[PDB]
Amino acid sequence: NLRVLLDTAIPPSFCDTVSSVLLDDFNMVSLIRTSPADSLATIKQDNAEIDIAITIDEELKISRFNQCVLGYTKAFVVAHPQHPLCNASLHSIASLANYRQISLGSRSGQHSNLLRPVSDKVLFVENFDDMLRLVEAGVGWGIAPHYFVEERLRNGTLAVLSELYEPGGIDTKVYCYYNTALESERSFLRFLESARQRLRELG
């Protein structure tokens, strides 16, 4: 058995890439979604007995685990078109601190620098669906994965605020935290390459 964590920020396609690859070497292969806010929190419980986390979140040293980049994935800051900040420009791209944000919450209650919300006006949720619902009701703005918002953007339901901050949306790194145990074994090195490849070329 090889237990595996992908946070909800990882595209569902990546999910297809990994899985295929792993079954080449491994016979029993359990997959687990989690909020990016609960990813590292989860693996840090020994009982949870995770072997491989694929998450966007960062933490420097975690006991028992090693870290590496698999690649990068986009997110966008989004709101209801009519949302005050509709107009995108730089005075808006500091104003966010003043507006209500819909950020992911964490079991841990705590957030990492990467994921801790930016405004003091915050409304916590567990997953990006809860988030985007509330945001479609112009209740706030929020950041969510590219994949989640592709649809709604074309279907004029949602507007982007991010561009004048990071054009092309906000690239963030995808980490593989893995059990030190695996580092030696070629089984993993195999995954890692084959994974990495199909992620970039199709990233």
Add this chain to the structure above:
Amino acid sequence: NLRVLLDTAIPPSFCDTVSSVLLDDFNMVSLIRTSPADSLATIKQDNAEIDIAITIDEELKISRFNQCVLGYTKAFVVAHPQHPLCNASLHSIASLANYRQISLGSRSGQHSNLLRPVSDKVLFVENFDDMLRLVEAGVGWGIAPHYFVEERLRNGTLAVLSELYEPGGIDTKVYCYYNTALESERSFLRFLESARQRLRELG
């Protein structure tokens, strides 16, 4: 007068891109190198009266300033070829914690998550030259900008340790911290685009 900070991690070519662009709008334009470890520390002194910092370092809210991405730049983890970790593989890519690192030091004495060294065996320096000298004498490993190490890598003097962590070297974001003042003024928006462009296409 427009005062400008580029940390030493920013390529010297970028330096050419910015400068040209700014003089189109601005008549007096002072440029200032700094260690990436002193970049933010500097601008936070009001006396230093900086208008625009181009740095790799991150900090969430800084009073008086706004933040945005200009792009991404590579670094590599390097050592003397004969260095114990020569062989690169995953057991090495946790072993770094155990080896002597040559990290940048800071006037501030303090380091940000991004820049704070990884091993407990550390030797501080001010600039990447000091660093790479010591590293060519296999005294430690260290991370340094792509530009700094291109030469020496081809000239077999230095070996890379990073690949199996982040292949293609370690992409990190380049930030523009800028005086809230500028946000309105088109002069800057101009810089920002024209800058951004020539940085990516030639990144």
